[PDB]
Amino acid sequence: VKYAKESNENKCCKAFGQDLRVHFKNTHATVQAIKKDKKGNPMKLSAAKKFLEDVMEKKRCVPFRKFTGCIGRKAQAKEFKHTQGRWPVKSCKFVLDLLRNAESNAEMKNLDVDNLVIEHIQVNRAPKGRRRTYRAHGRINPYMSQPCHIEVILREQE
RNA sequence: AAAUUUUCAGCAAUGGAUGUCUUGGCUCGCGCAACGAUGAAGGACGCAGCGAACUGCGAAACGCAAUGUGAAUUGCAGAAUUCAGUGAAUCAUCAGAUUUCUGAACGCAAAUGGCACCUUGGGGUAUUCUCCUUGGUACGUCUGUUUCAGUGUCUUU
Numbered sequence: 005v006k007y008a009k010e011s012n013e014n015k016c017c018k019a020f021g022q023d024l025r026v027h028f029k030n031t032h033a034t035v036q037a038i039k040k041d042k043k044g045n046p047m048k049l050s051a052a053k054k055f056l057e058d059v060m061e062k063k064r065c066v067p068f069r070k071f072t073g074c075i076g077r078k079a080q081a082k083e084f085k086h087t088q089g090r091w092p093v094k095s096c097k098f099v100l101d102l103l104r105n106a107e108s109n110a111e112m113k114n115l116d117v118d119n120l121v122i123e124h125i126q127v128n129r130a131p132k133g134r135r136r137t138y139r140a141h142g143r144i145n146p147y148m149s150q151p152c153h154i155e156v157i158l159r160e161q162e
Numbered sequence: 163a164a165a166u167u168u169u170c171a172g173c174a175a176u177g178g179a180u181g182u183c184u185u186g187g188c189u190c191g192c193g194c195a196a197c198g199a200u201g202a203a204g205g206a207c208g209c210a211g212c213g214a215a216c217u218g219c220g221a222a223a224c225g226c227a228a229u230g231u232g233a234a235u236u237g238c239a240g241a242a243u244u245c246a247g248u249g250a251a252u253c254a255u256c257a258g259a260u261u262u263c264u265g266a267a268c269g270c271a272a273a274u275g276g277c278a279c280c281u282u283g284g285g286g287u288a289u290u291c292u293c294c295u296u297g298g299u300a301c302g303u304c305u306g307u308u309u310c311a312g313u314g315u316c317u318u319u
Contacts, residue, residue: 006175086165126174131177
């Protein structure tokens with residue numbers, strides 16, 4: 005529902021997550037790992053499934069580039085030339101569920117599921133959730149959720 | 163050189179400004195005189211075929227009678243008759259009725275459907291018994307009525 009991009013289609017497919025109950029800043033990190041390989045090329049879908057299942061096992065890890073403060077330094081992030089990293093599990097679930105739906109949309113358009121490539125994943129922030137936290141002295145403080153919107157667009161390579 | 167930070171643009175997000183609306187407000191002017199012991203205003207509790215509220219109404223309960231208009235109401239249901247009609251309507255009008263429990267509130271009361279007595283008509287060893295049932299019994303005050311009280315002023319049998 006209003007994507008950011010739009011292959012003349014035929015050769016491309018898309019999926020949208022309207023308002024998921026996950027952390028925005030953690031989904032932002034997963035999505036930046038999925039988007040490209042170690043070279044500048046766009047990453048294959050079979051690779052990004054095989055990645056996100058391994059991040060749930062805590063064997064591969066997600067590098068946190070943008071939102072750093074204060075994430076503990078792990079050896080698995082040497083993979084990305086970057087000291088900080090982390091295994092955001094619930095974030096990997098919703099992104100796997102979206103790519104699962106994005107491959108399902110490709111199966112109607114009849115193209116190779118084996119040759120698919122991630123053209124464009126993006127996370128937007130979503131409207132906030134309201135809750136109450138009670139402070140000493142009778143003060144009341146907001147506690148708030150940050151759900152996010154996830155676009156995915158795929159296509160064939162060659 | 164990536165990454166990060168900052169800047170500029172494009173697309174997306176977040177947010178509800180600007181613009182255009184408006185059965186509402188505000189102000190001025192002009193008419194009218196109509197609450198209540200024949201129970202007012204206000205309160206409480208109910209009532210719709212399927213409603214919580216808001217409007218309406220009171221066990222006749224989003225209404226009944228009458229009159230006018232003359233075919234709907236509507237979210238769904240049903241009713242179809244109500245269709246050249248002594249008649250559809252969340253219609254208009256409104257002169258006839260209903261109008262629970264309250265409240266000035268009135269038998270005593272009251273965080274109580276509490277506690278009395280009189281009374282009508284009927285229901286079950288009885289004039290005194292219990293029961294259902296109809297309507298009563300507050301305060302002040304005027305005119306009249308009836309019954310009284312006072313070695314108040316007088317006659318007197």
